[PDB]
């Protein structure tokens, strides 16, 4: 395998057609992304064996209380989303993972993430009218993988580095 990185946590405007593959370790905000017009996405990490409860998270500089549950032996990554700066976030998608790897991609007018349960997690999208202005802040080391090698990214998501 050949893998581009690791890059340190930073705020940046990812180029189109590169997966950002974040190697998360601790249980808070893994990454968040916004164009400040119609996309706000944040992926939050919950450790295994967590009964339903409220937890605090800083999303885009504002503190939010979010109810979480994870009675799995895997880690759970909740994809929180809103398309309007005045709305509250919604739990849009879930990725349940034993590898603790998370991805985000700008491509084809859409924003892509992984969801499902490893080893069978697959990509899904959010729409936007302003893809290019989406910048991403990662809170852990990450790699970049061209979209032409997405099958490898998917493999990493599902079975690890």
Q: Are 32 and 85 in contact (CB under 8 A)?
A: no
- The annotation status of 147 as a binding-site residue, yes or no, is yes
The b/e string for 115-139 (b: 16+ C-beta within 10 A; e otherwise) is ebebeebebbebebeebeebebebb
Query: CA 90, 91, 93, 96: dihedral to nearest 10 degrees?
Result: 160
- The annotation status of 150 as a binding-site residue, yes or no, is yes
Q: Are 66 and 44 in contact (CB under 8 A)?
A: yes
Annotated binding site for N-acetyl-D-glucosamine: 147, 150
Annotated binding site: 147, 150
């Amino acid at each position: 395998m050949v893998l581009d990185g690791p890059y340190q946590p930073v705020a940046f405007k990812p180029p189109n057609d590169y997966w950002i593959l974040v190697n998360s370790n601790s249980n808070g905000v893994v990454l968040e992304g916004t164009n400040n017009t119609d996309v706000w996405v944040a992926i939050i990490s919950i450790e295994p064996n967590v009964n339903s409860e409220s937890r605090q998270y800083s999303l885009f500089g504002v503190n939010k209380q979010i109810t979480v549950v994870n009675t799995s032996n895997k880690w759970k990554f909740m994809e929180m989303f809103r398309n309007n700066s005045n709305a509250e976030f919604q739990h849009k998608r879930t990725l349940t993972s034993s590898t603790k790897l998370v991805g985000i991609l700008k491509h084809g007018g859409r924003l892509w993430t992984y969801h499902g349960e490893t080893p069978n997690a697959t990509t899904d999208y959010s729409t936007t009218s302003n893809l290019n202005e989406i910048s991403v802040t990662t809170y852990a080391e990450f790699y970049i993988i061209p979209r032409s090698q997405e099958s490898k990214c998917t493999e990493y998501i599902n079975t690890g580095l």
